[PDB]
């Protein structure tokens, strides 16, 4: 039930003594829809086994999100390798706005309205798992209270 959706499909190649053989990589993300997201990325010589490996890898290495009713808790900046990620909670009546590679991670997180802007690299493999940072190290009011005292 955890919102299976793909992101991008890419064709990568080898060079060998015979010549150039091809393979296909698939980008998918999954998540229950209440503060929990898993992402996957698999490779195969054909497209459907790559997505199969992608969703299967997505349904592991599970990372939870500290989440309110439909949106985040604070602005937080996410970086990874070359991509820089900006997220900002919005009003309840507002929908979600993001880039296409910034999109599908967010609906499977349960977030419904965030001002999301991608900075620097627009690489779909790189912007994903950069959005996971921010969600992964997110701070909630109740446990920072335990972190401090009140």
């Amino acid at each position: 039930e955890l919102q299976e959706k793909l992101i991008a499909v890419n064709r990568v190649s080898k060079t060998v003594k015979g010549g150039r053989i091809f393979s296909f990589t698939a980008l998918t993300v999954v998540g229950d829809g209440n503060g929990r997201v898993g992402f996957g990325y698999g490779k195969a010589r054909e497209v459907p086994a790559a997505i199969q490996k992608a969703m299967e890898k997505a349904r592991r290495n599970m990372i939870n999100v500290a989440l309110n009713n439909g949106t985040l808790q604070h602005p937080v900046k996410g970086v990874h390798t070359g991509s820089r990620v900006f997220m900002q909670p919005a009003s309840e009546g507002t929908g979600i706005i993001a880039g296409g590679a910034m999109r599908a991670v967010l609906e499977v997180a349960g977030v419904h309205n965030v001002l999301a802007k991608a900075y620097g690299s627009t690489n779909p493999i790189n912007v994903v798992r950069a959005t996971i940072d921010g969600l992964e190290n997110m701070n909630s009011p109740e446990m920072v209270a335990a972190k401090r005292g009140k």
Binding site: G93, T94, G95, I97, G100
Partner: protein, 205 residues
């Protein structure tokens, strides 16, 4: 300032019923609806993200018969208003006088309902109105002129309006052939399948 072409091809492109026919005959018998119009209509779409974005935009445009430039100010008025923008456009779209006439059922089609408003035949609050896109405020009593009263188009339209929902926010009365706009409809009242969130993200780019 209307599409005024063949109607079922518009329903054939969207694949569902768009209520541009009266309902006297089944739409399956009238057209081969299951595949898109044209020679290449039976093929798989594999439609893009912007494709289903656009298809949802044309869809809600084509039940209500509203052009794109008129659709944009409908969103712009919904954007400047408070509340959620998605149902606000749906609230603004339901305020059209030809749509109200169809929703109370004086018109067999909303194109037919538009002709009733255009041909000087609809009285609101004791005032005749020609403009089809007239926004109807709450507590407004729609009515018919002396002409088009007990005329054959408005009788046959009423008899096929019983089998529909008979919507809650309007008080239809076929005995004196009039009605009142009690409340603005909400999102829970109108068919529950219109992807109004796909509408917003097309005009947000």
């Amino acid at each position: 300032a209307r599409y005024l072409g063949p109607k079922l091809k518009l329903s054939r492109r969207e694949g569902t019923d768009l209520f541009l026919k009266s309902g006297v005959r089944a739409i399956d018998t009238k057209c081969k609806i299951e595949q898109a119009p044209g020679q290449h209509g039976a093929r798989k779409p594999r439609l893009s993200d912007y494709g289903v974005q656009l298809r949802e935009k044309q869809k809600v445009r084509r039940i209500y018969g509203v052009l794109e430039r008129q659709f944009r100010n409908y969103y712009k008025e919904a954007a400047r208003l408070k509340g959620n923008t998605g149902e606000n456009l749906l609230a603004l779209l339901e305020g059209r006088l030809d749509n109200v006439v169809y929703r109370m059922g004086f018109g067999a089609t909303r194109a037919e309902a538009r002709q009733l408003v255009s041909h000087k035949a609809i009285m609101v609050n004791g005032r005749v109105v020609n403009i089809a896109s007239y926004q109807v405020s709450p507590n407004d009593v729609v009515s018919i002129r002396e002409k088009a009263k007990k005329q054959s188009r408005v009788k046959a339209a009423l008899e096929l309006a019983e089998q529909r929902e008979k919507p809650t926010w309007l008080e239809v009365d076929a005995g004196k052939m009039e009605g009142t706009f009690k409340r603005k409809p909400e999102r829970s009242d109108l068919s529950a399948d219109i992807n109004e969130h796909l509408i917003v993200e097309l005009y947000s780019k």
